[PDB]
Paper text:
In this work, the flexibility of the EF-hand motifs are examined by crystallographic and thermodynamic studies of binding of Pb2+, Ba2+ and Sr2+ to Calcium Binding Protein-1 from Entamoeba histolytica (EhCaBP1). Thermodynamic studies confirm that EhCaBP1 has five binding sites for Ba2+ compared to four binding sites for the other metals.
In CaM, Ba2+ has low binding affinity for EF-hand motifs compared to Ca2+ For EhCaBP1 also, Ba2+ has lower binding energy compared to Ca2+, even though the difference in binding energy is not very high, therefore it cannot replace the calcium at low concentrations. This difference suggests that the EF-hand motif is flexible enough to accommodate metal ions of varied size. One barium is located at the same site as calcium The extra barium is in the close vicinity of EF-hand 2 loop, with partial occupancy and coordinated by residues K43, D46 and D48. Before placing the heavy atoms, the fully occupied barium ion site had difference Fourier electron density at about 10σ and partially occupied barium ions has about 5σ level, clearly indicating the occupancy level. Our work has also provided the first successful example of replacing Ca2+ with Ba2+ in the EF1 motif of a calcium binding protein.
Author numbering:
A (entry chain A), B (entry chain A), C (entry chain A): 4 to 65
Write the structure that this text describes.
């Protein structure tokens, strides 16, 4: 449950400092998750890296 | 006065480095201030922490 | 070329870690570049710093 994720110390309470620590790491993730998506959207062969011809395709008109 | 806040060293000038340091800490505050607001909006008893039943209320439909 | 900027190590590939490092430093720049613009927009004499009377002008109605 979401509460148990935030209430890190596990004492049934969520301190401000904890909410804050969560609120941020939540945001910190759809960043990593979006970028990853954007990435693999470019890396076609899922080989781990983008070469010139993938980067080439990705950009431009038509 | 706002100028005296930014011109930290107090020499009548505001360097870029200072504006920058201010511009950021200004932003750094409505973050803390908004979240705090959001927080105490959830913590009903203002006891310092949110328990399950407050978190319970906060979320959901109806 | 943009690719050579990102592919820092210069091995023809762009790792995620690199894209990420780029994506951020790109963003990190229009920040510095916008603020600088805003700054020199205030510093009229381009002397390096804003005095009271420039800051005075900058603010307000009429
Ligand atoms: Ba706790
Ligand atoms: Ba893929
Ligand atoms: Ba590839
Ligand atoms: Ba100064
Ligand atoms: Ba309250
Ligand atoms: Ba409470
Ligand atoms: Ba590389
Ligand atoms: Ba100027
Ligand atoms: Ba000046």
């Amino acid at each position: 449950a979401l509460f148990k994720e935030i209430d890190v110390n596990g004492d049934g309470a969520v301190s401000y400092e904890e909410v804050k620590a969560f609120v941020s790491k939540k945001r910190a993730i759809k960043n990593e998750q979006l970028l990853q998506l954007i990435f693999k959207s470019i890396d076609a062969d899922g080989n781990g890296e983008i070469d010139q011809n993938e980067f080439a395709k990705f950009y431009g008109s038509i």
